[model samples]
Target: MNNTDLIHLIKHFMHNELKAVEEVIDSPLSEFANLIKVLQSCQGKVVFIGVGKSGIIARKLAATFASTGTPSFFVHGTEAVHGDLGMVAKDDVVILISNSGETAEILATLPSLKKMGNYLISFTRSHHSSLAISCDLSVEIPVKSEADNLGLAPSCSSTVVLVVGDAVALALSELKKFTRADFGLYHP
Candidate 1:
C-alpha cells in the first residue's frame, strides 16, 4: 500500500466505485422491471449462485432478500456440483453473479440448473457472455476497471453489485408492503 494519507486514498477508491454504479443506472430499466416482476411473483424462493468474491456477494444478497420478505438462499458453484443442487426447487428464481459472465465455475452449474426447471437470471458485466446468453434473463452491471491501479482486485465491481442488489431487494420489500411490524417479525 502507498504510505501517504490512507483515508484520502480510500475516498479516491470510493469515488471510483460510485462512478461505476452511476454508469449502470444510465444503462437500462426494462430488464430491471422484468426482473422484479419475476422475483416478486415466483412461488418458490430465490437462489443466488456464484464463486469466490462474487459468491460472497451472492450469499449476502440471499440473506438480504430473505430478510426483506422474499425467501432466498445461496448456493456455491462448487457445492452445486457436489449434490447441493438438490436444494434448489423447480419454481425458484436462480440468480447467478459473476464479474466476468464467462466464469467457468459459475457456468459449470448451468446444465443441471436448466433441467431443474428454474427461471434463471444473471448479474454480470455484460449481457453478451455465456452466462448471460444461457440464462432466461440477464442484468448487466458494467465495471470499466477496478479501484486499484493494478486492476486486479474486485472493489468497484463488488461494490456496485452489492449496491444494486440491495436496491432491488428493498424495492421488493416496499412493493410487498413490508412494514415496520414485518421488520420486527424478521428481526425478532
Candidate 2:
C-alpha cells in the first residue's frame, strides 16, 4: 500500500475500533457501574499494571487517572513479585492489562495480588483469558490480527483499550464529583 492507502487504512481501523467499544458501553449494567462506585469509595490509590506494549498503555492510563482527579500509579506485574509489589497495599485497586490475557509475567503474581487483598480488574481481548478470569472483573476488547498487513501498528486495539480506560476514569470521576475546581485545588 502507498502512503495515502496506509493512512486511509489506519483511519478505517480507528473508526471501527472506536465503534467496537461503543457497542460495549451501550449495554453497561449495574455490576460494572458499581465497580466504579467501589473505586470511588476507596481511600487508597489505583494502580495500573501490565507488560510490554501493554505496559506503555498502562502508564498512559495511570497518567490519565491521576491527571483527572484519581490518585493512581503504575506497577510492573513481574516487578511486583520482586519487591515492587510494595507499591500496592490492602486498600488499593488494580487495573491490569494484557491483550492476550495470558502473559506469564502477570499471571505469576496473582497469588500475591490476591493475598495483598487487592481488588483486581483486567482489560483483555477475551473474558476467558487468564487475566480476565483471574481478576475480580474484566473489560473485553474486540481484536483482530495486527501483523503489519494493515499499517503494522498497535493503533486500533491500543486506542480502544486506552479510550475504554478513559471512559471508566471519567465515569468514576463524575460519580465521585471530581471537578475542574477540585483539580484546580491540587494545582495551587
- How do the residues 1-188 of candidate 2 rate in per-residue lDDT, one tens digit apiece? 99999999988766766665565567544456666776787788999898888888899989888878889999988788799998898888888888889989989889988888888888888889988998887777656654355645665567767877888788877777788888887777
Q: What is the TM-score of each candidate against the true structure?
A: 0.95, 0.82
Model 1, 1-188: lDDT tens digits are 66577877988988888888888788765689998998988999899999989999999999999999999999999999899999998788899999999999989999998778789999999889899999999998888999899988999899889999999999999999988888889998
In model 1, which regions exceed 4 Å deviation? 1-4
lDDT of each: 0.91, 0.80
What does the lDDT read for residue 92 in candidate 2? 88
lDDT for model 1 comes to 0.91
Residue 129, candidate 2: Cα error in Å is 1.1
Most accurate candidate by lDDT: 1
